[PDB]
Design a binder for this molecule. Structure first.
Ligand SMILES: Nc1ncnc2c1ncn2[C@@H]1O[C@H](COP(=O)(O)OP(=O)(O)OP(=O)(O)O)[C@@H](O)[C@H]1O
Ligand SMILES: Nc1ncnc2c1ncn2[C@@H]1O[C@H](COP(=O)(O)OP(=O)(O)OP(=O)(O)O)[C@@H](O)[C@H]1O
Ligand SMILES: Nc1ncnc2c1ncn2[C@@H]1O[C@H](COP(=O)(O)OP(=O)(O)OP(=O)(O)O)[C@@H](O)[C@H]1O
Ligand SMILES: Nc1ncnc2c1ncn2[C@@H]1O[C@H](COP(=O)(O)OP(=O)(O)OP(=O)(O)O)[C@@H](O)[C@H]1O
Ligand SMILES: [K+]
Ligand SMILES: [K+]
Lengths: 429, 216, 429, 216, 216, 216
């Protein structure tokens, strides 16, 4: 079935990926059973967590395998499947999978979205990454420069989190090129391919879809909240951002407000933040960025819908409405299903890990959220995980990326009861 | 063991309500939501379902029922289709309500196990009581022989049973007397019969009406 | 004003309560501004947390003020208001408030519920508490025995959490009388007054309301899960339950499975539990017990509804149905509003406290949840709270008890827009 | 006193709206959702309920109410059933709107405490004012004696109270005069009556019309 | 600067579609959900609302709008009530669609600012073009004087503007010529007029028809 | 080859059900929800959509289909609009169901690729079998020549294929014989023909009926 095909195919490219990475040519120092599967999974589920450092452990070859898996997961397993066939057409059966894969209600010219998204991807990936990230990165030479400038784009656009070198980009806290060029890439990758195609086509402030409108104003105002949050909280704290010029205090406060959904790049260390900021960063990375998309757990719109729904209820207008175009019921209940599932899974991961591992609590909590949110950010349990803890993070990374729903729908017995039942009074207050 | 009442009419609803009061297992089915909600309290179960759709009938687990009653009597199409489904799904006992002679015929041919005309039947019984103001109630043993409950006229007030013998004289037999609520089952001659007492006679239909004419 | 009246009246008996407790006659050692308000609030919001120990700091008089406030909050501010008037009738305006206060959809003979609940309360409070807790508690004499046996009942039935003496009842880990008589009291107080009246009247396994049916089977199976959970996890751990006879290992595993919603009594210390159990206890005390009720944050039924709703959606039956009597929509969306509000508040309390205080994370988290859930259980920040931290726990205790909804409805501008708006397509996946 | 208005008609809705303006406790009931929503602001309380269903009436806690008004005047079946329920549920005062003589009769027999024909009553009163262009308003004390408010014609302009006496001439008594809005109650002869001034007379119905003919 | 179109008819819907294409602020209102949904894309805003209910009209914030157009032309009751509301709510400009002479009269009396009969008006204009096959289009300057667009017959093919004078002969003046799409505004004599070329004449209505008769 | 069946009638629904059983790609479209739900299992795919709205048709990605079948035969307006849309959207093959001669005409003019009258066609074929009780089934090769399947009368029982020659005698040729289910294709003289066997003859329409008359 459409959900299963998404699942089995996705799982396979992780196994494929793991066997490729465990392969000699890609490893400098011999690699574990569990770690080969974990690192592979995190590239293909575009998470960003790594048990083993990427720049050190993986050969130029293995790092290309990493890019491939990042490319695969970031755009979507099916997207390439369609492209393979396209280049090699196109069935309805196929158009059905694609629609499911790009979480679309309609099958309406959905291959036209696959056409656009891919062409737009490799386009902005190339021009911004190769070109602009070579302006200020051939002080690594050519053999190092052109490969690290490219790798970081494919990782950026796709919201991976994978930086080649040990500092997950702390080195460049202030560098405007790396700041801008990498945020440009990972925010626009984030918001809907819907939003990109819509903005490219319609071209006017007004003529944007209710989705696109919500996404453009939503991503803007949440970023502006989070930046103000990261600034105000981490301003005094000397550990991070205390010892920075008033200007570099921004480039960091900006970046850390923006990276949690769902990029995974470090401008500062996350281990050394006032616990409040971390708490806030948890919420900010439950809510991913966009539904198109590159990745999320429950995606920004979902959050709006459920929130605005409850707000509406509390007033209480009989129907939930944004932007004066009202929101149908089947959206609310799907939102409520996306929401509950994701949270319940994250809770089980937290509960599991406090029994799988001996470690600090907040660190487990941040770790589970970032695993499901395919974020990539840690205060650093990641290298310190138990073999069992790595497993359950691998699971949580798999479900989080594939979507908590389409995972259930893979083993869900589809039951259509046509009969109704009498009303039942039940107090909820 | 298990009863299913499809169609919560005045007839159907009375069966569910009674069987449930008797404390049986009864499934109340109706396409109208409001009807189901109403009989919720008066049934082991209530379910909104269109009995003409097969999958909907299977969802009830209809094959689980020993006796299914189709008390849809206004809609012939609904009734016939439902009963056909039930027979096709191998229900042992199918009891259906019919509208008229023709609906009865369709039901007969599609294998309804017992067909009932609640209105027509109650019609003839009430008509009898209208025509003959003396007959309160009755039950037919056959076409010819019947047990009849009669309201006693002043023509019988303070009369003795053996004195006014129904048996020797008319070939009928008196079975019970009800004076002021008190009941004398199988009464022994002589017994006093007051006016407005319930007299229960038994014999030939023609014989009783002859007693009604000459005795009362 | 039905929501406001509930709120202002409830807030007042806390202020009344605080001024009464700050009064000389009730205190042995002079008491703070903040602490008088906190301890008062916790008795009247039937929470169970105390900054200052109850057995030591409060005179026999002050401990009676504590019982009064516990009685007031446990049954409901309005319940007494109605009784006052009853004994002194009864208006519709009043019947409106009562219905709101006992979270009822209908105003149908709702005073008959007030009549029953109160009479049943003082009835079981007296007979079980005075009598049964005096047969095995006159080992404190008469002046101590007959007062501590009574106090603990009013505290038990009402899900307070307030034990008179320093061990919040650890002393009696094994004692069957205290175990049974106190669980009998705090579980039946918990489940709906609906459930009590219904069980008392209808008297048959069969003829119980959907609510009552859900509550009786719900409370049973969750308790049986939690006991198995507490046992399996805290079995090995020597800190608690490690050094107990196989029989007393039960009386503790039972009690700690049952007390989190929302009693607040200690059979074991919560500070020394494998973090897993605590995580589990968090969830178990987000979900209160019953909606009638004595107390909760988001009540057991609400949890079923939302869960069973998502489960249903995922299958997906077009309508959400339990026990083959289907659940109407207005219940789902209220459940979704109760749910979101409570969780969002708890999150703000956690975020606030990691800024308001220097302390361990898990301990703040457990503290917020238990404050909102009016639970009463702590890993022990309670005495160690900052003056500001005490404030924000007071708020969280106020909202949690009153209901997160009826709080919003007190300052909510009721707007009923009759106009509808066109459909809006929005991706949530 | 607690009031329940079942049926938010033009009549029912006016009772609810008035009683609420007077500041009483009024429960507004109607089967139509839109009607309930409308009167929400103009009632102590508004509820969607079908007054013919018993359980729905108990849910309102109808037994709480001293006075229940059934202002359903178009549907006879709705009205009669509701009022029957109310009487069965021992409501002290049941005031019902009737459609016609026959509906009145059914209500009478099922124990409605007071029956009102708002339209028929206002009909005859308006008809009186149509026929007799002089009568502005009136109230009947009995079948024969009545207090009538009359518009003064030019036939009375600048006439004195004693001068044009009715207390001697016609056996009627003038109670009030309203000139340009100003009111003179129990006026003392002589007083000036201008044209178009409200004259309030009192006496026998025939006597007044005799004054109307000869005086005006 | 703000427009509200109540009633998304063929007429109303065309106003809201045009004004929006011109890039104004237009609120599209309709009681029918399906109509609102349809014009969602072709309006600054779309809202489902019953324009006869006051609270619903206030919810739109109707008092915001400079111009409100009531294009309900089939329902007289809906139209009159709505416009009355709008006038009562002090809307500066109220433009309403009328059904017939009588509906126009009701609107006139309740203070509609401008009343339009889109069908009747377009009727007479089309009728003119039917009767006179030569007149393509026209605009009346008054009851007597008019500018008319005429299709040139073979009776004018390759004729000169000076040669076949309208100014001296008939008292009318030619304003434009359209040959094969190309336009000669204010043409200077002589100019070639081919067959089927749009000739725009101006003068007295009777004068033009005299030219039509004798010239063409 | 991808198929889209718009209108899940008895006709449409049979096409989607068949094409799907053959294992093709079929999109089942219908405005009625209940129809879509029903054919969900019997189609590659089912969607609720109003085929007259363009945006709704594009949402299906209709331009992705090689063959689209419009089996709306009761609503002429629905059918004509839909087919017009499909032609405008450049669908290669549009097969439509027609109601009557006139509907056929409109479809013809708006470029439907093939028009079918399933009822009229099956009408004439069944009528033939009614009139001529011998003809079980047939297929017309042209207006004059036809292959006919005939039920053999006792007039042919145990007759030899050659002995009773149709080839020489009537100018027709026997193609098959079906005795008790067993089939003899292109039979060689002589063969036994029993009563009630299926005889398949081929030739001129008039010629066959002459054989029917004299042979049977
Ligand atoms: N397709 C159906 N499936 C199940 N129940 C149906 C169906 N159609 C109708 N019903 C119900 O079955 C019942 C049959 O009632 P029907 O009114 O149409 O007349 P009736 O049986 O003669 O009524 P009564 O029993 O009062 O004399 C009704 O409750 C009706 O709503
Ligand atoms: N079963 C019911 N329960 C509650 N309200 C009902 C019920 N049936 C009808 N109504 C309401 O009662 C009223 C019925 O009375 P009816 O409106 O049709 O008007 P009326 O009494 O004849 O005169 P008027 O409209 O001038 O008051 C309606 O407002 C209707 O909505
Ligand atoms: N009370 C109302 N409130 C809001 N909208 C209404 C109301 N009454 C009618 N409408 C809408 O306004 C329009 C009224 O137009 P109506 O079609 O029914 O005839 P019409 O004016 O002659 O239509 P047309 O413009 O095509 O000639 C419709 O779109 C209708 O849905
Ligand atoms: N605009 C539409 N878009 C999609 N489906 C439609 C549309 N209009 C009608 N239908 C559906 O087309 C289907 C075909 O039914 P149609 O009623 O119009 O009659 P029919 O051709 O005579 O039926 P049948 O094929 O059994 O003889 C119906 O299920 C109907 O609901
Ligand atoms: K990531
Ligand atoms: K508590």
């Amino acid at each position: 079935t459409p959900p299963q095909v998404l699942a089995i195919g996705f799982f396979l490219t992780i196994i494929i990926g793991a066997v490729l990475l465990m392969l000699p040519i890609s490893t400098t120092k011999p690699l574990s059973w569990i770690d080969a599967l974990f690192t592979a999974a995190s590239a293909t589920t575009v998470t960003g967590l790594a048990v083993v450092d990427t720049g050190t452990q993986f050969t130029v070859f293995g790092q290309t395998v990493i890019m491939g898996l990042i490319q695969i997961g970031g755009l979507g397993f099916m997207t390439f499947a369609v492209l393979i066939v396209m280049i090699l057409k196109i069935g309805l059966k196929e158009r059905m999978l694609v629609q499911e894969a790009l979480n679309q209600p309609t099958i309406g010219g959905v291959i036209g979205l696959v056409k656009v998204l891919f062409l737009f991807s490799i386009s902005i990936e190339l021009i911004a990454a190769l070109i602009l990230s070579i302006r200020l990165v051939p002080q690594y030479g050519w053999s190092s420069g052109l490969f690290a400038s490219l790798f970081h784009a494919i990782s950026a656009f796709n919201n991976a989190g994978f930086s080649l070198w040990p500092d997950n980009l702390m080195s460049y806290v202030g560098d405007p090129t790396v700041n801008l060029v990498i945020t440009f890439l990972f925010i626009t990758g984030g918001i809907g391919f819907t939003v990109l195609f819509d903005v490219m086509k319609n071209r006017r402030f007004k003529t944007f879809s209710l989705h696109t409108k919500l996404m453009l104003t939503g991503t803007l105002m949440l970023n502006a909240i989070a930046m103000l949050t990261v600034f105000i909280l981490e301003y005094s704290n000397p550990g991070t951002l205390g010892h920075l010029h008033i200007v570099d205090k921004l480039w960091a406060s900006y970046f850390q407000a923006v990276t949690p959904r769902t990029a995974g790049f470090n401008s500062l260390d996350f281990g050394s933040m006032r616990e409040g900021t971390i708490v806030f960063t948890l919420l900010l990375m439950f809510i991913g960025a966009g539904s198109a998309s590159t990745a999320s757990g429950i995606k920004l719109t979902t959050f709006i819908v459920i929130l605005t729904s409850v707000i509406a209820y509390l007033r209480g207008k009989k129907e939930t409405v944004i932007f004066r175009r009202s929101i149908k019921y089947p959206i609310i209940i799907k939102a409520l299903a996306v929401s509950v599932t994701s949270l319940f899974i994250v809770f089980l991961g937290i509960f599991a890990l406090t029994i799988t591992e001996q470690a600090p609590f907040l660190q487990i909590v941040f770790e589970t959220f970032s695993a499901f949110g395919t974020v990539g950010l840690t205060m650093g349990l990641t290298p310190e995980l138990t073999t069992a803890g790595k497993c359950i993070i691998i699971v949580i990374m798999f479900i989080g990326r594939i979507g908590p729903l389409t995972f259930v729908f893979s083993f869900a017995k589809t039951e259509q009861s046509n009969i109704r039942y009498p009303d039942g009074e039940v107090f909820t207050g | 063991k298990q009863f299913a009442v499809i169609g919560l009419g005045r007839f159907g609803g009375s069966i569910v309500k009674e069987l449930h009061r008797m404390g049986h297992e009864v499934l109340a089915v109706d396409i109208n939501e409001e009807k189901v909600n109403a009989y919720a309290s008066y049934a082991t179960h209530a379910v909104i379902a269109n009995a003409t759709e097969e999958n909907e009938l299977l969802s009830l687990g209809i094959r689980n029922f020993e006796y299914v009653i189709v008390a849809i009597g206004a809609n012939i199409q609904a009734s016939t289709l439902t009963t056909l489904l039930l027979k096709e799904l191998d229900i042992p006992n199918i009891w259906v309500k019919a509208q008229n002679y023709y609906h009865h015929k369709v039901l007969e041919k599609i294998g309804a196990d017992r067909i009932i005309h609640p209105e027509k039947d109650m019609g003839v019984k009430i008509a009898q009581s209208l025509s003959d103001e003396n007959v309160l109630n009755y039950i037919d043993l056959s076409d010819e022989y019947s047990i009849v409950e009669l309201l006693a006229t002043r023509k019988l007030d303070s009369k003795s049973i053996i004195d006014l013998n129904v048996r020797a004289k008319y070939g009928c037999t008196i079975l019970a007397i009800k004076h002021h609520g008190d009941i004398c089952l199988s009464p022994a001659p002589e017994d006093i019969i007051r006016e407005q007492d319930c007299l229960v006679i038994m014999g030939h239909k023609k014989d009783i009406k002859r007693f009604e004419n000459e005795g009362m």
